[PDB]
Amino acid sequence: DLKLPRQRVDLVAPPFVHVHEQATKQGPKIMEFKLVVQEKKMVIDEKGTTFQAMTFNGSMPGPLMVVHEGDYVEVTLVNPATNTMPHNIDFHSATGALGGGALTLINPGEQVVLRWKATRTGVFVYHCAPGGPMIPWHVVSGMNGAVMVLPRDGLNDGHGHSLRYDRIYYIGEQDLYVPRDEKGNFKSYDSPGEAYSDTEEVMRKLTPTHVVFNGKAGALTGKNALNANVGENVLIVHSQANRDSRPHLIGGHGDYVWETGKFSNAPETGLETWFIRGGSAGAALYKFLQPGIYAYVTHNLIEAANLGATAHFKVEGKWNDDLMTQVKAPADIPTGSTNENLYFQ
Amino acid sequence: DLKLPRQRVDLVAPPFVHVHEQATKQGPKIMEFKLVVQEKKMVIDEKGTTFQAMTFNGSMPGPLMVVHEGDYVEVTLVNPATNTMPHNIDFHSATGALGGGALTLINPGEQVVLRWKATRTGVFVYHCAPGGPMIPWHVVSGMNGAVMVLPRDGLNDGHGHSLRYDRIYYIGEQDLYVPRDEKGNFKSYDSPGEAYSDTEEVMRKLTPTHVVFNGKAGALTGKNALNANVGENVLIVHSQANRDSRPHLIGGHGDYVWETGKFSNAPETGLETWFIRGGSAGAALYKFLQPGIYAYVTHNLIEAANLGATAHFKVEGKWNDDLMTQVKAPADIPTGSTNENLYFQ
Amino acid sequence: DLKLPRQRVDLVAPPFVHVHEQATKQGPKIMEFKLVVQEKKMVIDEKGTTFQAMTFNGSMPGPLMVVHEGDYVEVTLVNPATNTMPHNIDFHSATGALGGGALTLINPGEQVVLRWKATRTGVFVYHCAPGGPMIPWHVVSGMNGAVMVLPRDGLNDGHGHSLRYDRIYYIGEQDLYVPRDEKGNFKSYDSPGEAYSDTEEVMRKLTPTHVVFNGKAGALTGKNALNANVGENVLIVHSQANRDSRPHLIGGHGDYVWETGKFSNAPETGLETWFIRGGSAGAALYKFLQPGIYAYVTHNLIEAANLGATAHFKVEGKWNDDLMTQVKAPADIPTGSTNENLYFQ
Numbered sequence A, B, C: 001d002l003k004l005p006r007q008r009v010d011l012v013a014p015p016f017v018h019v020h021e022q023a024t025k026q027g028p029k030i031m032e033f034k035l036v037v038q039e040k041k042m043v044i045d046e047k048g049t050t051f052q053a054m055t056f057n058g059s060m061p062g063p064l065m066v067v068h069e070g071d072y073v074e075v076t077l078v079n080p081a082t083n084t085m086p087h088n089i090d091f092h093s094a095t096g097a098l099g100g101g102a103l104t105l106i107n108p109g110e111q112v113v114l115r116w117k118a119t120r121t122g123v124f125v126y127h128c129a130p131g132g133p134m135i136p137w138h139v140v141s142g143m144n145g146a147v148m149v150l151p152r153d154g155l156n157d158g159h160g161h162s163l164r165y166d167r168i169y170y171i172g173e174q175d176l177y178v179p180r181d182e183k184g185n186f187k188s189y190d191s192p193g194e195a196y197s198d199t200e201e202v203m204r205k206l207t208p209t210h211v212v213f214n215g216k217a218g219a220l221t222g223k224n225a226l227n228a229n230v231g232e233n234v235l236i237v238h239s240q241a242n243r244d245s246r247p248h249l250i251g252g253h254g255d256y257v258w259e260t261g262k263f264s265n266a267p268e269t270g271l272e273t274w275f276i277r278g279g280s281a282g283a284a285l286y287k288f289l290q291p292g293i294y295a296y297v298t299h300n301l302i303e304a305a306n307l308g309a310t311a312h313f314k315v316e317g318k319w320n321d322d323l324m325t326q327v328k329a330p331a332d333i334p335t336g337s338t339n340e341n342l343y344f345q
């Protein structure tokens, strides 16, 4: 008896995002999405460590869903018979029934259809939450993604100015808890169930073994670096379902940042580093001003460099020597400065 | 020589709050509170682990004190002779003398009276701080609570609109550091003094063994779930004297959130998850829109599910199918969708 | 071909700050700074633990640089031949080339000159970042500081009111990762290179052994406490290049706080505790209202009291009994209150 037009959305794997409008003149629709749970072995680091992952749609993170304020979101959650345990979904964007979790518990072989009204604007986490200690285990096994609820007039700066992005990426950050043997080597398991007890022991100490973007160390570097061009305004949505993060674009800034991720709040301007509280998504716009490689990290640099949490942007364009220049290339230190430099020891 | 009316306040145990007005037409008063230090053995988890706690008024957290801007707060701190060590109090709401700590050090058998002017609006931590390494030990042994300094016109949205709560709860979150023996079992001690050396070693590694609301895992679930009704605007004050938290109302939102907890700042709107920086209190309003069970957690879900940091609300009322509905109950996956679902692996 | 006046700045060791104007009527200048890298053994705690530090200008943190919006900042980075490895610099204030890191890699015996335009107002981290796992190692070995880019009209409250400080201090917070032997004693090394492998193992577990201000436990206490006077408005800049912090002025507040550190954003008012996200600087103003000792901490009190993260202010002036008073000094508990006090157990 909800008498609105239906609009079917085909999700795409992160860090890319399905087609959508920012500002729209469409009225509310029933926006139809399908998420299929896949338990699978995944590679999580550069040394080939494997992990018995649990995912929405086969990815870590799960895909970004994009709708507008006042849309209804009708989600078909599917739990294929090849999976081994029950799964459900909690949308932080939704109101009631534990975000949908109390209405979406499905055994392998089942599917369920949940509808929730998009009454709250922002980027939000969604994640599996089957009950009790399965909640954090499913989440840190990979069962989390995000949904973006745009205002119908698109983003604004909180001061009556339209903001429009030329390009959007979704960076899901994942804390992983991989058991080690007595020698310190990561252990392999044949099934998520078999990994559980040893994994819970690692989780209890609250220190991840890996902190990764798009499901693995190096996922968003090399061949898979994120592309942009000088002059493009890029929206970077960052989610972390379980653990804090502090995103930073090395060589750039956050021109407009919704740290808490909710578009009813004016963004902060000109940030160096922002903060994603665990259990949320945030978003930053940046207009690229310089070409070259940028590193996008969590700015616990140990996590970024040593536990997997670095992405790269490769930005095409022309260097701006006014914003930054190498005045003198590396050269031998001159002897006339010896005394003066002795004051800086 | 302070010539103001005196108003005696009877504190109540958390998560409840003593009677108070939001908006008031009273002038400044000397608001009189008594806190009695109690060192006692307490049960902190569902498996019956005990802990040599140190508390204000016998609870973790200590009770919420509520006053208005411009009140004077006259605190009688009592340290009964049955206690074993000196205690004092630091009010983050207060100006000078280390928040009062430098004026309130009392041995067992003594009491002291401190007055501080409520010049700063917000929710604030108070905690014991006797000196040196006793400061964190007393705090993580339970000696912390909060005080709320309301504007005399009550809360506002920072945009000239009154906000009024129908119901207030105080959620004190406590990080606990319980030693284990060689087998991993929590160790028991006969006195706080005896627990100290082993406890300090756990504290030094910065990883709590337990993270609890209202002093124990499960405190605010079952018989002790928090009650509300659809339509009620509920203020949830959350404090953490030592360690960060990221509160989230599962199935709800923060309609108005003062993350940093200070009412001279406009609240943020529509948050999924907020952030309580260790050593502070914050506050969130929410108007319940749906009945049923809600989980209120720190959204490090390992802490929430596995270390004790889950509360429940039980909300009475009528379900709103417009905000959320189960369109189709769990059903066998249909064979016609096989090919299409293969794209989501 | 940049045709602007040159202004040479002599840096001073933290927590002090070189001479500068807040509001200025000068036009843009090329502001000339020199940073000299010094690898050296440093003492980091009260028990005399040593550490093979790597620094800018011989200090942890590196010195605070102060410029105005629209200045160009011409940095001569020097890597003396007595050092053992390559170093560079990333300015979070700068746009392009990984903050300057991709233009400033210098071997021992070399120097380089980088110019970056100060287009972004705020306090910002700068740090070494030579590549890969050297990035966090160099940073947590001490190679970080901060730069402040003031608006040309000085600070404002975001509501068209000038804010002016009478006194500025720069508090650099440093997370340190010092290996221990089998007995738990901190280990000593002859060179940074020799310390690396054991240090990386500690870094990987994300738990610092020490958390210090101005490079060592106790640095800013006793003889080196920070001075102020009642009535002075003090700007406290706090940076943390790698790890979150939650600053708190015990006995005071943050009157105006830029938690994220960027002056294009209105400050928050009346904070108890604020949050420095790792990889950033923030800033707080406070006008002292009371004399006496204040403790300035990170309000993980375990870090503050037990891992080194306490500074002191010594504030001269007259006590204000209206803001706070000891109404009654410690006295024996009276027998008439016995029954009533039994309700607070």
Ligand SMILES: OC[C@H]1O[C@@](CO)(O[C@H]2O[C@H](CO)[C@@H](O)[C@H](O)[C@H]2O)[C@@H](O)[C@@H]1O
Residues within 6 Å of the ligand: A096, A097, A098, A102, A103, B291, B292, B293, B318, B319, B325, B326
């Ligand atoms: O009390 C509401 C409770 O039920 C859920 C599902 O588990 O939504 C349902 O609520 C009622 C059942 O008690 C019905 O009125 C409604 O039709 C049903 O969908 C939860 O969302 C909520 O927690």
Ligand SMILES: OC[C@H]1O[C@@](CO)(O[C@H]2O[C@H](CO)[C@@H](O)[C@H](O)[C@H]2O)[C@@H](O)[C@@H]1O
Residues within 6 Å of the ligand: A047, A049, A183, A184, A185, A186, C204
């Ligand atoms: O980390 C402890 C210890 O384990 C070893 C192998 O014994 O390496 C493991 O840990 C490294 C750090 O996580 C990984 O790079 C590697 O994949 C894993 O086998 C040692 O090398 C290390 O000292």
Ligand SMILES: OC[C@H]1O[C@@](CO)(O[C@H]2O[C@H](CO)[C@@H](O)[C@H](O)[C@H]2O)[C@@H](O)[C@@H]1O
Residues within 6 Å of the ligand: B096, B097, B098, B102, B103, C291, C292, C293, C318, C319, C325, C326
């Ligand atoms: O310098 C102030 C210092 O003293 C305290 C108490 O320990 O408040 C006191 O301050 C003065 C004593 O030096 C007196 O003028 C005043 O009467 C007294 O209460 C501290 O609050 C402060 O740190």
Ligand SMILES: OC[C@H]1O[C@@](CO)(O[C@H]2O[C@H](CO)[C@@H](O)[C@H](O)[C@H]2O)[C@@H](O)[C@@H]1O
Residues within 6 Å of the ligand: A204, B047, B049, B183, B184, B185, B186
């Ligand atoms: O946690 C390590 C190890 O210790 C054991 C008992 O040897 O359990 C202890 O730790 C559990 C997790 O904190 C608690 O649930 C329990 O109360 C405590 O005795 C093992 O079961 C566990 O592997």
Ligand SMILES: OC[C@H]1O[C@@](CO)(O[C@H]2O[C@H](CO)[C@@H](O)[C@H](O)[C@H]2O)[C@@H](O)[C@@H]1O
Residues within 6 Å of the ligand: A291, A292, A293, A318, A319, A325, A326, C096, C097, C098, C102, C103
């Ligand atoms: O693609 C830009 C890239 O180069 C750097 C230095 O490593 O700045 C340089 O950029 C170009 C070289 O590819 C030149 O046009 C420019 O002169 C030069 O300084 C980096 O900052 C940036 O990442």
Ligand SMILES: OC[C@H]1O[C@@](CO)(O[C@H]2O[C@H](CO)[C@@H](O)[C@H](O)[C@H]2O)[C@@H](O)[C@@H]1O
Residues within 6 Å of the ligand: B204, C047, C049, C183, C184, C185, C186
């Ligand atoms: O901390 C573990 C263990 O090591 C010892 C010496 O064996 O002390 C070391 O650690 C202390 C805490 O960091 C330091 O204060 C000290 O400098 C260091 O040698 C033990 O005393 C302690 O139990």
Ligand SMILES: [Cu+2]
Residues within 6 Å of the ligand: A054, A086, A087, A088, A128, A129, A130, A138, A143
């Ligand atoms: Cu699941």
Ligand SMILES: [Cu+2]
Residues within 6 Å of the ligand: A090, A092, A125, A127, A279, B248, B250, B299
């Ligand atoms: Cu959640």
Ligand SMILES: [Cu+2]
Residues within 6 Å of the ligand: B054, B086, B087, B088, B128, B129, B130, B138, B143
């Ligand atoms: Cu105490």
Ligand SMILES: [Cu+2]
Residues within 6 Å of the ligand: B090, B092, B125, B127, B279, C248, C250, C299
């Ligand atoms: Cu405190």
Ligand SMILES: [Cu+2]
Residues within 6 Å of the ligand: C054, C086, C087, C088, C128, C129, C130, C138, C143
């Ligand atoms: Cu370096």
Ligand SMILES: [Cu+2]
Residues within 6 Å of the ligand: A248, A250, A299, C090, C092, C125, C127, C279
């Ligand atoms: Cu950086």
